[PDB]
């Protein structure tokens, strides 16, 4: 699916327009996940299994506890990555907080298992030796 910065920008402009109308009243997360999930990442998704996934992410992150520090990483019970939504601080702090999240890339960030990475590395190795086979010149030039 083609996801673009315009798709994030779009969903910010709608979020802005919905947080300017509520003000002191409680935010409408349930209203705001549909427009985020089903509309801005409707356009791309037709499969209806990817659609169920696309929303589940969004249901997980977006609720009342988000404004309090909340583990953005899905079901990290006792793994220890624990990348939270920063509390009230100056703007500059937010960019530093993203550099403070561990440099190590894990699939565990996305809710997948570590052993999902092991499969990707195998698929990476497979796609090398399918491209090498295509370009392997002259078939050894006989003997």
């Amino acid at each position: 699916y083609p996801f673009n910065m315009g798709d994030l920008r779009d969903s910010y402009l709608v979020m802005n327009r919905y947080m300017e109308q509520n003000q002191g009243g409680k935010v409408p997360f349930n209203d705001l996940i549909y427009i985020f999930g089903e509309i801005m990442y409707g356009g791309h998704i037709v499969d209806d299994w990817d659609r169920r996934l696309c929303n589940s992410y969004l249901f997980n992150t977006m609720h009342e506890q988000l404004f309090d520090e909340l583990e953005l990483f899905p079901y990290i019970e006792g793994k220890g990555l624990s990348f939270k939504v920063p509390g009230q601080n100056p703007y500059e702090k937010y960019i530093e907080h993203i550099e403070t999240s561990l440099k190590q890339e894990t699939p565990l960030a996305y809710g997948l298992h570590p052993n999902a990475e092991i499969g990707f590395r195998t698929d990476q190795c497979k796609t090398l030796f399918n491209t090498l086979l295509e370009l392997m010149p002259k078939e050894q030039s006989r003997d």
Partner: protein
């Protein structure tokens, strides 16, 4: 030096020869625009007198060269420079018109959607009003022509307009006389407003009498008869939004029944309206009532979904999401900020205005007459496709519905706009679209608050597509700033009406695709379009044909045809698609209208079985009969046998044919007669050696022995060539009458197949159906009883005339060709 002098002479000839062809062609056009247009003549008196001084010259200079015919004698550097003199002056009197046409497009901005030829014609016949009205069918969604008061002097065409006529000939009368003033672009802009005023004026009268058909003597069904299709739908949806609003206010009080009573009342009106489409009605007042069915069936499905999910609060998303239609004079009107006020009722703030709300996009109803165009079935997908597009128009960017061809991306964008009221224009982008051609579209779209759907926009040259972006950006960038007057790229200062939208209907996996530059995709909020759920379309088609329990039956129906595809022996002559559904529902509908008291389940069961059996082969008869017996468990089907025709077929087969009248044989003759009575075009297919000819020949010899002389002209279509069959022009431009086509003319009247008393004539075409051959006949194969030829001579097929195709195998046949017959 003899040669190079001769080369210079040919070099001189080639310039002056091309200069007449440049002038003559450009003159011929500009001449025709001035010729027979005293209207256009008096408008530009400076560039018309100049032109008359260039035509009168040209005719004299042409008759002075006629003496010296040869190019060598005719060609002079004197002649050349004079013709360059005209190219320069005819360029000025074509720039004069082009700059004048732009003035009249800018004055009345629907003209931008007319072909420049049609605009020149309307402007030429500004006095002759009824010729102008003819071309407003191109401009508008409905309003094909106007009605008129027969005038004082019969030589004069009538100015005074007493009503408007739709493209299906539904009349909407005007409150008083609408006169056609001097200028064309002036009385048209006066008309464009009056359209919306009457529509608006009638809606006040509708919503007053709409609150009255709750309690008052006049029911809902008898009330719908009085008003237009557009206004009788809007008023139905306005009193639904009211009802569900009163149901939420009650359910805040604590009354649990409120949302169940709301559900009950919606489902009774829907049932009571299905009993109206069953009883014999006028074809205009079918759709005025069936468009109300397809909205009411959705109304029900929403209030069900509220009762199941137990949503007991208004301003929950569930209710915001749904497309609502209010009828309030908001004393705290936020509408002047949300959009711009255009119309006088919108600005009045004393009289009640129709407002349309959906997920924080509230925009007044822009009353553009539609004229009983068929509303699509409202699916769970289309509900979302409204949220997407509305959110896009509120976020001041275009909306890009995208999915496989046949989904109806273009149709769902049109229907949203038609619901909102707004005029939706459609463009068939063919990769011949220049910068200028597209620039004119957007300028006219921008000025006249309209919605540009672009059917197959995906095939626009990536060159011109990179401009489209620069033009679309410039308009959208203006809408964000909310500028009334905005600068376009060329012809800067132009009016912008706030309600403009853009929609690019892109077939994502279509061949010859120009991938949109990332720039352009970032202006167009995409939508995911799936082939509409077969269940929902059948559930409509069932309610169209007088079935009260349609919902349940329609789930049984989708199940049958879906499983049938999987577990029967795949044949080419089987059609389990939606096309074959409609036919079996039509034949079930004629059997409902015959006997309404019978339960709906045994009647559908009978119809489904009765028509799918003669399609189905021996192997599949035993499994299919079981498959129906699964879906309809305990229903015992009685075989509906024609008792009179079966006797007269048995008698003919023995007496005047000689063949043995087997019980299974006459069952096939009865099964052909029933197919021919509803379907003009039949396929008596089978294995090579079987009773295919003998079955249709015995039917004829009963129609002779019961009704009147059934004539038949048996041609083998594949035997003769496709050119010789239909007929085509010789080397000399003289159109030869071909075999099928001359039979089709000879049968209408004057031959042996003529119409004196012949109750059923039919031509039998006993060759193998191939795509190239049948393609020319595809017009008649469809619902239209109309045959087109190479000479453009039409042969309108009579309703008492059939096409019987006797085919062994449908191996080369297209899946559509099978469905048609």
């Amino acid at each position: 030096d003899r040669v190079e002098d001769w080369r210079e002479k040919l070099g001189r000839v080639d310039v002056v020869v091309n200069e007449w062809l440049k002038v003559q062609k450009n003159w011929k056009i500009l001449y025709n625009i001035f010729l027979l247009s005293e209207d256009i003549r008096m408008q530009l008196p400076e560039d018309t007198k100049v032109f008359e001084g260039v035509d009168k010259e040209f005719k004299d200079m042409m008759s002075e060269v006629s003496a010296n015919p040869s190019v060598v004698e005719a060609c002079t550097i004197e002649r050349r420079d004079v013709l360059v003199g005209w190219s320069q002056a005819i360029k000025k009197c074509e720039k004069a018109l082009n700059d004048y046409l732009e003035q009249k497009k800018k004055s009345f901005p629907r003209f931008y959607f007319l072909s420049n030829q049609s605009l020149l014609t309307i402007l030429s016949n500004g006095q002759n009003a009824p010729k102008v009205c003819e071309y407003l069918g191109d401009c508008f969604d409905g309003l094909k022509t106007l009605t008129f008061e027969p005038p004082a002097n019969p030589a004069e065409t009538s100015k005074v307009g007493i009503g408007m006529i739709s493209k299906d000939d539904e009349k909407v009368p005007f409150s008083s006389k609408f006169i056609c003033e001097g200028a064309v672009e002036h009385w048209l802009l006066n008309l464009e407003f009056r359209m919306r005023e009457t529509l608006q004026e009638i809606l006040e009268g509708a919503k007053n009498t709409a609150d009255l058909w709750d309690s008052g003597d006049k029911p809902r069904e008898e009330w719908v008869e009085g008003y237009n299709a557009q206004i009788a739908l809007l008023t139905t949806t306005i009193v639904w939004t009211e009802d569900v609003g009163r149901a939420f206010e009650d359910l805040a009080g604590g009354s649990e029944t409120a949302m169940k009573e709301c559900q009950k009342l919606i489902e009774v009106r829907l049932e009571n309206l299905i009993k109206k489409v069953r009883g014999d009605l006028h074809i205009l007042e079918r759709w005025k009532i069936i468009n109300i069915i397809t909205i009411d069936v959705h109304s029900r499905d929403v209030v069900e979904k509220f009762v199941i999910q137990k949503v007991s609060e208004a301003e929950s998303f569930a209710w915001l999401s749904q497309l609502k239609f209010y009828w309030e004079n908001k004393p705290d009107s936020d509408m002047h900020l949300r959009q711009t006020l255009r119309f006088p009722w919108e600005k009045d703030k004393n009289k009640n205005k129709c407002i349309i709300r959906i997920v924080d996009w509230f925009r007044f109803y822009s009353y553009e007459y539609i004229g009983n165009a068929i509303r699509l079935v409202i699916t769970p997908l289309t509900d979302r496709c409204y949220i997407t597009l509305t959110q896009a128009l509120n976020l001041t960017m275009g909306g890009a519905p995208a999915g496989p061809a046949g989904t109806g991306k273009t149709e769902t964008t049109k229907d949203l706009g038609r619901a909102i009221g707004i005029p939706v224009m459609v463009f068939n982008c063919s990769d011949q679209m220049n910068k200028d051609s597209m620039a004119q579209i957007f300028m006219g779209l921008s000025q006249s608050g309209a919605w540009g759907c672009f059917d197959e926009f995906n095939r626009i040259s990536i060159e011109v597509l990179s401009v489209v972006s620069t033009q679309v950006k410039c308009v959208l960038d203006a809408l964000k700033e909310k500028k009334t007057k905005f600068s376009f790229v060329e012809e800067g200062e132009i009016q912008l009406q706030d309600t403009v939208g853009f929609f690019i209907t892109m077939n994502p996996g279509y061949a010859g695709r120009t991938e949109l530059p990332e720039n352009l995709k970032a202006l167009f909020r995409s939508c995911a379009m799936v082939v509409p759920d077969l269940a929902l379309i059948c559930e409509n088609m069932l309610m169209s044909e007088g079935f009260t329990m349609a919902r349940v039956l329609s789930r049984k129906f989708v199940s049958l045809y879906m499983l049938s595809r999987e577990l029967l022996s795949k044949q080419k002559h089987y059609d389990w698609g939606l096309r074959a559904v409609k036919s079996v529902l039509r034949q079930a509908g004629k059997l409902k209208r015959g006997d309404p008291d019978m339960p709906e389940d045994p009647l559908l069961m009978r119809a489904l079985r009765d028509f799918n059996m003669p399609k189905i082969v021996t192997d599949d008869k035993v499994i299919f009969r079981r498959l129906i017996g699964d879906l309809f468990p305990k229903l015992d089907p009685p075989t509906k046998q024609n008792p009179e025709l079966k006797k007269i077929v048995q008698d003919t087969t023995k007496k005047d044919m000689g063949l043995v009248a087997e019980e299974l044989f006459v069952t096939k003759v009865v099964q052909l007669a029933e197919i021919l009575e509803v379907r003009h075009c039949c396929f008596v297919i089978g294995p090579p050696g079987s009773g295919k000819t003998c079955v249709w020949k015995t039917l004829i010899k009963s129609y002779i022995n019961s009704g009147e002389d059934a004539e038949y002209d048996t041609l083998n279509p594949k035997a003769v060539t496709s050119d010789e069959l239909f007929g085509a022009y010789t080397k000399t431009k003289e159109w030869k009458n071909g075999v099928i086509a001359v039979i089709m003319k000879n049968q209408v009247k004057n031959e042996e197949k003529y119409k004196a008393t012949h109750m059923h004539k039919w031509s039998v075409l006993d060759g193998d159906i191939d795509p190239e051959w049948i393609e020319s006949l595809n017009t008649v194969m469809d619902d239209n009883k109309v045959l087109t030829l190479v000479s453009n001579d039409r042969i309108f097929l009579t309703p008492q005339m059939r096409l019987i195709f006797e085919i062994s195998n449908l191996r080369n046949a297209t899946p559509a060709t099978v469905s048609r017959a």
